[PDB]
Design an enzyme around this catalytic site. Structure first.
Site, short mmCIF file in Angstrom:
data_model
loop_
_atom_site.label_atom_id
_atom_site.label_comp_id
_atom_site.label_asym_id
_atom_site.label_seq_id
_atom_site.Cartn_x
_atom_site.Cartn_y
_atom_site.Cartn_z
N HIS B 41 0.77 -1.23 0.05
CA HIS B 41 0.05 0.23 0.13
C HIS B 41 0.87 1.29 -0.23
O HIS B 41 0.31 2.28 0.01
CB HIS B 41 -0.97 -0.29 1.11
CG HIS B 41 -0.48 0.00 2.52
ND1 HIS B 41 -0.29 -0.95 3.38
CD2 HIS B 41 -0.07 1.08 3.26
CE1 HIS B 41 0.09 -0.44 4.62
NE2 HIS B 41 0.29 0.65 4.34
N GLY B 143 3.19 6.64 9.68
CA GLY B 143 4.58 6.36 9.32
C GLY B 143 5.18 5.10 9.71
O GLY B 143 6.34 4.68 9.10
N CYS B 145 4.52 2.02 9.19
CA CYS B 145 4.46 1.05 8.22
C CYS B 145 5.52 0.62 7.67
O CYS B 145 6.36 1.28 7.40
CB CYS B 145 3.27 1.12 7.03
SG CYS B 145 1.42 1.22 7.79
C1 LIG Z 1 0.62 2.70 7.81
O1 LIG Z 1 -0.13 2.78 6.32
C2 LIG Z 1 1.40 3.86 7.65
O2 LIG Z 1 2.34 3.98 8.23
N1 LIG Z 1 1.73 4.63 6.59
C3 LIG Z 1 2.65 5.88 6.27
C4 LIG Z 1 1.59 6.44 5.10
C5 LIG Z 1 0.97 4.87 5.38
C6 LIG Z 1 -0.26 2.78 8.63
C7 LIG Z 1 0.24 2.76 10.04
N2 LIG Z 1 -0.82 3.10 11.16
C8 LIG Z 1 -1.67 4.38 11.11
C9 LIG Z 1 -2.12 4.42 12.64
C10 LIG Z 1 -2.01 2.86 13.24
C11 LIG Z 1 -0.94 2.35 12.31
O3 LIG Z 1 -0.66 1.08 12.32
N3 LIG Z 1 -1.52 1.63 8.42
C12 LIG Z 1 -2.63 1.95 8.00
O4 LIG Z 1 -3.12 3.54 7.94
C13 LIG Z 1 -3.52 0.97 7.27
C14 LIG Z 1 -3.41 0.98 5.84
C15 LIG Z 1 -4.94 1.42 5.35
C16 LIG Z 1 -5.76 1.58 6.49
N4 LIG Z 1 -4.74 1.33 7.70
C17 LIG Z 1 -5.20 1.26 9.15
O5 LIG Z 1 -4.46 0.70 9.89
C18 LIG Z 1 -6.87 1.42 9.39
N5 LIG Z 1 -7.07 0.49 9.76
C19 LIG Z 1 -8.50 -0.22 9.50
O6 LIG Z 1 -9.02 0.42 8.52
C20 LIG Z 1 -9.03 -1.46 10.14
F1 LIG Z 1 -10.27 -1.26 10.82
F2 LIG Z 1 -9.05 -2.53 9.25
F3 LIG Z 1 -8.13 -1.86 11.14
C21 LIG Z 1 -6.81 2.72 10.30
C22 LIG Z 1 -6.22 2.74 11.94
C23 LIG Z 1 -6.23 4.03 9.61
C24 LIG Z 1 -8.31 3.01 10.51
C25 LIG Z 1 -4.16 -0.03 5.08
C26 LIG Z 1 -3.84 -0.05 3.74
C27 LIG Z 1 -5.11 -0.99 5.86
#
Ligand SMILES: *[C@](O)(C(=O)N1CCC1)[C@H](CN1CCCC1=O)NC(=O)[C@@H]1[C@@H]2[C@H](CN1C(=O)[C@@H](NC(=O)C(F)(F)F)C(C)(C)C)C2(C)C
Ligand SMILES: *[C@](O)(C(=O)N1CCC1)[C@H](CN1CCCC1=O)NC(=O)[C@@H]1[C@@H]2[C@H](CN1C(=O)[C@@H](NC(=O)C(F)(F)F)C(C)(C)C)C2(C)C
Ligand SMILES: [Cl-]
Lengths: 306, 306
Positions: B41, B143, B145
């Site tokens: 992603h 951040g 991930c």
């Molecule tokens: C990760 O993507 C990251 O750090 N990134 C830098 C820009 C992308 C991020 C890490 N996070 C955010 C806060 C907690 C955590 O572990 N992961 C994501 O945002 C996930 C990405 C999207 C949606 N993600 C979620 O973790 C979401 N969870 C859900 O939708 C759930 F209900 F299935 F758990 C969220 C916490 C944003 C609601 C994908 C691809 C799964």
């Protein structure tokens, strides 16, 4: 989200650990530039450690009596002096992996990571707090002496602890990297015990802020208090006095959550008087006092190290 | 003496972390030999992550659309493929700091260290357990991930986790390094929740052994039980079944303390039925289930890593 006891990444410090042997005593040393630092009781036998005269033991040693190894490689010693309870061995090689670093004497209440080492090799890493009574609650076996505690700031390692000994009750005592003990301890095998500990109040509040930030809010009450009243109530539960400096340091968390420190103090006062009645905070059934305000912010805002 | 949540030293893994940017999404990658592994992603926008077609997003990218940085230095990408939920970027440079390593898919109950990273930089290190419900209780911000979990065996890093997402209740879900999720989770922003967790029984017993070893013995009773009876009583408290394999794995601790597993099981049965009545074990008011038998021995016998 989530809140964890989190150590600093240990890699910069890993590159500094060596094994030091003298006679038949082996422990860990810290190799920075062309100096190896280790506890001075490396020059003792078992027998000696009951009541050692270190100056006398050291007069009878020459450079060559100290065997320093970094992996396979032996470093050749070309000098030695004693500074307080630490031994400085000058070596013919500067450590190419010397990070930017400082030596700090931390204050009671401050936290740090310990890199536990045996035979100059890293076993594991964990976060500790220097207790009000100048002990730490570590995990140290025989062989661990000369393991170090440290903080990382951006790219700079602040070394603040070297491990020497264990006291009745399984707490741990050591020196700064200039070889001054924290607390009233001495490096001999004689009966010594730690003062009665107290709870680090400012750290408990930091932790309550961390809990709000993580959405654990059940303990937030609708009251304020004054700093005076709070301190009288906290005194009976063996909490340290909260100072105005403490209040100011908690300012960032206060502003970030929109909860004034004295309203959190009101909340903690209630928890101390009524207990947690079956409830946990951030997964804990007991109040936690080994997270500083800095640790909370670092963790809950994502601060990193080059 | 002392018993602590202890992470593996993170240095070998620090040397592998990089930042990966694609479009305006940045996260962390793992640079081993001439391959960078990261969550797939990275190729999404915010909008995309609500319901992404990754194969379609990736067809529209070329090598040059991925910016990989190791400190100051940009690595030039010369290939890309997707494997399950991970992206493999072939780079023009092999990582000189590649440690000996393997990719492992761990089992529920097993523990590992997480090196939490932002922008390819290490924030901190902590120990986790893969829960029965295939989540971990981490500390991860935006951040984080592509942060990885790992075990070290002597000189070999076994990588077992890469961080992808957070679920309601602030638990964390991710993949092995071949990009298969642990548990039934998918890498899209849609409502997903973790199964009800259970307590890892074998780990609780390991921890009780650690407590005896550290001289906390108050809960040792004078009874035995059978494996059958214990499992019926533990079932109602949402403890996993203890198998004969579990019993055999606890053999070293059993032999070292001179306490048969089923006598410890008798002790735990009592603690579950009567509670701890104001008492702590190893400083904890709650029973701990995130120490494996191996972790206990490692810690209580001093195992190190080259
Ligand atoms: C990760 O993507 C990251 O750090 N990134 C830098 C820009 C992308 C991020 C890490 N996070 C955010 C806060 C907690 C955590 O572990 N992961 C994501 O945002 C996930 C990405 C999207 C949606 N993600 C979620 O973790 C979401 N969870 C859900 O939708 C759930 F209900 F299935 F758990 C969220 C916490 C944003 C609601 C994908 C691809 C799964
Ligand atoms: C440390 O010396 C070491 O690891 N060595 C390799 C060979 C020397 C060792 C580390 N240990 C042992 C178990 C717990 C711990 O931290 N430290 C020492 O043995 C201390 C050395 C002697 C006596 N030491 C003690 O820690 C003792 N404590 C006391 O006498 C006390 F009551 F003051 F605390 C002991 C736990 C052995 C009773 C000196 C120079 C203080
Ligand atoms: Cl607890």
């Amino acid at each position: 989200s989530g809140f964890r006891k989190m150590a600093f990444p240990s890699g910069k410090v890993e590159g500094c650990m060596v094994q030091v042997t003298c006679g038949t005593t082996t422990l860990n040393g810290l190799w920075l530039d062309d100096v190896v630092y280790c506890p001075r009781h490396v020059i003792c036998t078992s027998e000696d450690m009951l009541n050692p005269n270190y100056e006398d033991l050291l007069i009878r040693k020459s450079n060559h009596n100290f065997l320093v190894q970094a992996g396979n490689v032996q470093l050749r010693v070309i000098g030695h002096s004693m500074q307080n309870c630490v031994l400085k061995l000058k070596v013919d090689t500067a450590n190419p992996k010397t990070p930017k670093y400082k030596f700090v004497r931390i204050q009671p209440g401050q936290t740090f990571s310990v890199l536990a080492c045996y035979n100059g090799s890293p076993s594991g890493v964990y976060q500790c707090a220097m207790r009000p009574n100048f002990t730490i609650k570590g995990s140290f076996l025989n062989g661990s002496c000369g393991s170090v505690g440290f903080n990382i700031d951006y790219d700079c390692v602040s070394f603040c602890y070297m491990h020497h000994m264990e006291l009745p009750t399984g707490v741990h005592a050591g020196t700064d990297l200039e070889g001054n003990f924290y607390g009233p301890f001495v490096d001999r095998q004689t009966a010594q015990a730690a003062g009665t500990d107290t709870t680090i109040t400012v750290n408990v509040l930091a932790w309550l802020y961390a809990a709000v930030i993580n959405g654990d809010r059940w303990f937030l009450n609708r009251f304020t208090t004054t700093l005076n009243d709070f301190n009288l109530v906290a005194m009976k539960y063996n909490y340290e006095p909260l100072t105005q400096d403490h209040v100011d340091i908690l300012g960032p968390l206060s502003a970030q959550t929109g909860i004034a420190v004295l309203d959190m103090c009101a909340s903690l006062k209630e928890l101390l008087q009524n207990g947690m009645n079956g409830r946990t905070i951030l997964g804990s059934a007991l109040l936690e006092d080994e997270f500083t305000p800095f640790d909370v912010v670092r963790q809950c805002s994502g601060v990193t190290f080059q």
